[PDB]
Every structure is written in C-alpha cells, then in structure tokens.
C-alpha cells in the first residue's frame, strides 16, 4: 500500500542499493566514452 | 623495615587461565609481578625462518611473521633451554633452539589450508599449542610453501611473540575505598566482579588509613605455558632479576670501598 515510517529506512536504502547495482560509481566516465 | 608476608588464594585454575588473589603485599610488588607475566617470562617462539619455496599469495616475511606468532609448547623444555646468545654453539644447536620444518604443496582443486599442524619440530617437547589449528596461509593448486625455522628462547620484553599471556586482568580496591580513582558520579559505574557492596551502595566509605592490598589477578595463557607455570616462572624470574642486581651491587659496594 504505502511505505510507513517504520519501514522507510529499509526501503530508501533498497532503492539506493538498486541504483548502484545498475550504475556503479564511474558510469559517467564510461557512458561519456561510449557516446 | 622488612619484607611483606604475602598470601595467595587461588580462585580458579584451568588449562587456559588462573584466577588468584594476593594479600598483604605492596602495590609495587603486585604490579611488578604482572609486568613480569607479560615481559619477563621466557617461552619458545620461532625467531629464524628460511623459506626454500613460497608460491603462496603472501610474501616471505608475511609468512615468517605469522610463524613467529604461533605459540609453541614450552612448559618444561624452556627452563633447560639456553639463550642462543648465551649458548656457545655456531649460532644454533639443540641446546638453545628447536628446529621446525614446513613443506606443503597443493595439488588439488580444493584450497589447501596450511595450518600449524603442518609445522613439524625435531623436538617432541616443543610443538605448536593447537596440536583447531592456527592458519598460516591458504594455498591454491600449484602453490607450495617450503621452509625451515628455528625456535629459540626469549621473553616478551624483546618481542610480543614471547609474551606468554593472552591478557592479565589486574585489580585492587574494587569498591574504591582508597579513592585512587574519583568518580564524578559513582552511581553510573558498574560494580566490580570482586565488589562486596550492596546494590544500593556505589562506593565503599573512604578509608583514609587504607593501603592498596588484596590484589586480584586473572592470568590467561596463550598456550605456551600453563597459566600456573607463568606465575611460578614470573616469581622466580623476578627473584632472579633482584638476586642478579644484588650480586652486581655487592661488587660495586666493594669497589667503592
């Protein structure tokens, strides 16, 4: 339904973890060179 | 003007630790005993490594470092063993050192754990304490570690590998009657395991005439010596330090006159 405050801390870091699973940390350098 | 008459009450004696209380002693004597436990009790440790082959992922003096820190059984052999410097041999011999050999080759897809069980000594008296075993290095297939090492006598004042203790708990005045430590808020401080105060009480009443006595010890052994052997060796070692000083002092007094 909705993310309650008692679950927000777990939820937000699952979103953050997924972001770095997809992008990493040097995605800017590699994306720029690929272009 | 004369010596104390200290008494000993051993509270616990296992293969790992000895817990005892010394009473009717000065704080300096009690403290000097615990410093000898750590720094002046001789044991046997590896202090010489030649590495014939080392294909592992750890460099040579990484492996040697780990070997030196492996505790070796030195309960009774240590007393009759000599210091290499004192020994008259050609830098090594059975009277002042124990030879060790390690020859491990990995030929299997499974990672090979080179442990202290692979350390082989020419003296049955001096063996690695664990023989779980202490891991020296993990070998991949095709990697080998071949070395020979010598274990010699020494005490913790030279290197921490000759320290026989895994922790020396020392305490006195658990209720702070002497006020040697001043708590800004005594109520916030947990009671000592040796404390003899009620739950409501936080500090013992100040004892202006009191002196540090009834010192509590918990000598935990690494394994080289029995915990009781450490204390007995420390008392004889500290006694030998003073007797040696007295012998030198006597000559100095004679020379002065």
């Amino acid at each position: 339904d909705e993310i309650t405050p008692d679950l927000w801390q777990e939820a937000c870091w699952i979103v953050i973890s997924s972001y770095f699973d997809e992008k990493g940390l040097v995605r800017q350098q590699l994306d720029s060179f690929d272009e | 003007p004369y010596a104390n008459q200290p008494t000993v009450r051993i509270t616990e004696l296992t293969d790992e630790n000895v817990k005892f209380i010394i009473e009717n002693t000065d704080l300096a004597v009690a403290n000097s005993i615990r410093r000898v436990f750590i720094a002046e009790v001789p044991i046997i440790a590896i202090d010489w490594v030649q590495i014939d082959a080392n294909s592992s992922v750890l460099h040579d003096e990484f492996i040697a470092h780990r070997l030196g820190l492996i505790p070796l059984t030195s309960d009774d052999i240590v007393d009759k063993l000599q210091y290499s410097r004192d020994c008259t041999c050609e830098e090594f011999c059975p009277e002042c050192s124990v030879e060790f050999t390690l020859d491990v080759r990995c030929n299997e897809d499974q990672t090979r754990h080179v442990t202290s069980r692979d350390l082989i000594s020419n003296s049955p008296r001096v063996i690695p304490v664990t023989s779980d075993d202490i891991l020296i290095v993990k070998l991949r297939k095709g990697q080998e570690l071949r070395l020979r090492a010598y274990a010699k006598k020494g005490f913790g004042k030279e290197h921490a590998k000759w320290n026989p203790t895994a922790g020396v708990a020392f305490e006195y005045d658990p209720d702070n009657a002497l006020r040697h430590t001043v708590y800004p808020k005594p109520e916030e401080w947990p009671k000592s395991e040796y404390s003899e105060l009620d739950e409501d009480e936080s500090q013992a009443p100040y004892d202006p005439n009191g002196k540090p006595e009834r010192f509590y010890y918990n000598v935990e052994s690494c394994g080289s010596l029995r915990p009781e052997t450490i204390v007995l060796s420390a008392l004889s070692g500290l006694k030998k330090k003073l007797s040696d000083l007295q012998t030198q002092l006597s000559h100095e007094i004679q020379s002065d006159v």
Binding site: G24, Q29, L30, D34 | -
Partner: protein
C-alpha cells in the same frame, strides 16, 4: 586504416566488456576495479571532468571595472558540429561617460 583510438577500460569497446568476475580473474584483472581510465604507455590515465559555462544560454552580467554597465553574452555551439564555440556579446555602454 586512419589511426588508433585509446580505449577506456571496461567500456563497451574494451576487451573486458561483459566479462564475468571469474573471467576477469582469469585475465589477472580485479573485478572490483571500476575501469573508466586509459592505459597510455602503461600508465593508467584518468580524464578529469572540466567545468565550463553552458553554451547557447544568454547570461547577463555586470562588470564594474569595464566600460559596459551590463553585458549579455551567449556562447553559441552547433548541435554536435564545429566544436569551436563562437561567443557574441551584447553590452550596454556604461553611464560613467559624461
């Protein structure tokens, strides 16, 4: 053949592209290595991002020292053509002149 382009490691045109972590270890490459640099004569060279003012945008600034009360500049660049950027200024002359 017209030349050779230095390749950024772990990019789509790098040999270590799509290789699994086990494959990278077979090549003596650290899987945790992020790539994003060039090997130029054996030296790993990283290109530092260079911060510059946005182009094609009109910016109105004021310079006290200069003779213009206000200057509206615009660094114009094509849509991926003629890398050189031509800047045009539209400055209002200062009122100091009497």
């Amino acid at each position: 053949f017209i030349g050779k382009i230095p390749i950024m490691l772990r990019s789509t045109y790098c040999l270590l592209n799509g290789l699994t972590d086990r494959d990278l270890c077979e090549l003596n490459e650290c899987p945790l290595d992020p790539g994003g640099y060039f090997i130029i004569n054996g030296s790993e060279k990283v290109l530092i991002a260079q911060e510059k003012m946005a182009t094609n945008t009109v910016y109105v600034f004021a310079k006290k020292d200069s003779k213009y009360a206000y200057t509206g500049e615009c660094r114009s660049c094509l849509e991926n053509s003629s890398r050189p950027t031509s800047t045009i200024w539209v400055s209002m002359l200062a009122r100091g002149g009497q």
